[PDB]
Design brief:
heterotetramer; A: 146 residues; mainly alpha; Globin-like; B: mainly alpha; 7 helices; binds protoporphyrin IX containing FE; metal ion binding (chains B, D); transport (chains B, D); heme (chains B, D); iron (chains B, D)
Chain lengths: 146, 142, 146, 142
């Protein structure tokens, strides 16, 4: 997408303050609780029934780190996010069968967890650039659904 | 929020459409899978997801059937739709946003098969009703 | 967007059978009736209160031809729809203040009117290519909203 | 579809948030206009649409106010929200889909100001309630 250098700086600055170990687990677990139908893909993870269960499931936490870790490549390739996630988009579409609208609520929830952790330093202006980035990421993750 | 006018319109149009409901279902599902391929993610066990395939044709009549049943439950769709909601909510776990996609593909098929009967007036009422069936089905999700 | 020649042929074939004089008016008037809040931009057109009023308003019909006529350029520039509608997107955003989600329900309604007029020749496969095109057009119309 | 648990959660969280509601409103509106610039189309008469502008700060407290009022009307939001629906539906003509955008910007602001209090449990309930206020407001559109 067409990105300015300032935009690029903002996104790297936000991602610099992100603790993958804290934010992934929280973001992922909050998605499973607020939109409980997304639990249908996490059958092998054991009990993802309740918040309490969800929030203490180790496989959930581990997966949260994986998902959030994968954003690093988006963060580091802002010129070509589409192409960087092509392959990832095909395993989601063809091996995992994740409804791509699910990437949209995840993006919203991640944003919400980030706001909780950054507080007031997550300014409206920063949130606007983060939301433009989230939108390209979401679109990239849902691009190989045919 | 169905008004009595909305309900009388849906009922006058439905009596006219009821003989081709299986055809309409089959085709709306087929159209949805093909034009909105993200919905194909819920039917990955099915052998053929093409328009006209058996799985598709059978499942579309089942869905239309439930909607025709809903025309009789318009007074209490939430309560009327309760058990199917439960199913979609806890067994199938179908993201609710897919209900609007199906709805749009149903209107396209209705226009196609009943272009003269599918007036603006019929259009707005059936859209509201499909939205209310979607809402009823979504009710128990969380 | 990346379009194949077959896709390009499909879209031109559909647009070849479209009667701008019949389809614009119908599409526009059906939008105003099914999503009655879009009437708020058509104040100068006189009475757009009821279906009956809407469907006989000449200014509505005229505008329907204009809107639908403007798709010709999308149809003829499938490589660069974004750039072809840049300017149009800015008058909509800055002079008319049309909510861009309005372009989405218009696209749906147009599709519905086209299906009614083509009948069975509007196959699922054709509708899928028409919907990919509609999506680029909608995105292009909402691209200069800042 | 608010359950009694949903309502008790919204009520326990709201008592805790009520003193900063104007701040929360002002900031959620500000965030929406800036991060979702398509919503700026409804406020084109306003002099300044920036976060912290007067128009924004005033209007956001007005919107939060109506929502705080909705916490007391949770039994009948459709009926409770009736007059404001009418307004949004016939005077303002605000596309209903903008209600969900505002809702998301309200959750972001709540997380920011009440990160410890805004738990998952609080999150899901308030999301449902905001969705139900949106629905109530949308009710009379057509
Ligand atoms: C924000 C966008 C997302 C990114 C970047 C992402 C990233 C990943 C990655 C890197 C993997 C590892 C597997 C592989 O290499 O193929 C994965 C697997 C997976 N993801 Fe996604 N994911 C995202 C969103 C989602 C969402 C929203 C869901 C479910 C609602 C989901 C469900 C899964 C599942 C079930 C697996 C495989 C689990 C396993 O076998 O360990 N992902 N994801
Ligand atoms: C909104 C209107 C809908 C209605 C009235 C409806 C109704 C039904 C009914 C009645 C059944 C099972 C019939 C029986 O067991 O007797 C069913 C199953 C199912 N529906 Fe829904 N449905 C709707 C929307 C959807 C949508 C939009 C999707 C996917 C995007 C979906 C996915 C499924 C699946 C995957 C099954 C079971 C699959 C199988 O049998 O292999 N449904 N639906
Ligand atoms: C499908 C996408 C659309 C296209 C290609 C389109 C095209 C046009 C064109 C070519 C004009 C002429 C004015 C100029 O040159 O600046 C116009 C004006 C206008 N359009 Fe759009 N339009 C679209 C969607 C919409 C929608 C959905 C609405 C309202 C809900 C709308 C409302 C208007 C209004 C109010 C005017 C100006 C009326 C006048 O002063 O005559 N348009 N549009
Ligand atoms: C969903 C929650 C909402 C609530 C509770 C709400 C409530 C209100 C109230 C109470 C007023 C007028 C106050 C009075 O006259 O006493 C108002 C006015 C207004 N609202 Fe809404 N609103 C909501 C969402 C929105 C959204 C999402 C938009 C735009 C996208 C919007 C646009 C407006 C506008 C443009 C006005 C009047 C503008 C002006 O005064 O200059 N509202 N709203």
């Amino acid at each position: 997408v067409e990105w300015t250098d300032a935009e690029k700086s903002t996104i790297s600055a936000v991602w610099g303050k992100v603790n993958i170990d804290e934010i992934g687990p929280l973001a992922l677990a909050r998605v499973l609780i607020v939109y409980p139908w997304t639990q249908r893909y996490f059958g092998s993870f054991g009990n993802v029934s309740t918040p309490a269960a969800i929030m203490g499931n180790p496989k959930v936490a581990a997966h949260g780190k994986v998902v959030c870790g994968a954003l690093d490549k988006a963060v580091k390739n802002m010129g070509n996010i589409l192409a960087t996630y092509k392959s990832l988009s095909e395993t989601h579409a063809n091996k995992l069968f994740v409804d791509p609208d699910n990437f949209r609520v995840l993006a919203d929830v991640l944003t919400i967890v980030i706001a909780a952790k950054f507080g007031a330093s997550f300014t409206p202006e920063i949130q606007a650039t983060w939301q433009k980035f989230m939108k390209v990421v979401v679109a990239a993750m849902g691009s190989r659904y045919f | 929020s169905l008004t009595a006018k909305d309900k009388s319109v849906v009922k006058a149009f439905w009596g006219k459409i009821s003989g081709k409901a299986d055809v309409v279902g089959a085709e709306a599902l087929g159209r949805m899978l093909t034009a909105y391929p993200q919905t194909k993610t819920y039917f990955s066990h099915w052998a053929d997801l093409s328009p006209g395939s058996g799985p598709v044709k059978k499942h579309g009549g089942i869905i239309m059937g439930a909607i025709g049943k809903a025309v009789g439950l318009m007074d209490d769709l939430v309560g009327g739709m309760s058990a199917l909601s439960d199913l979609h909510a806890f067994k199938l776990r179908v993201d609710p946003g897919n209900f609007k996609i199906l709805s749009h593909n149903i209107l396209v098929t209705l226009a196609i098969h009943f272009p003269s009967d599918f007036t603006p007036e019929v259009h707005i009422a059936v859209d509201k009703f499909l939205a209310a069936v979607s809402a009823a089905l979504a009710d128990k999700y969380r």
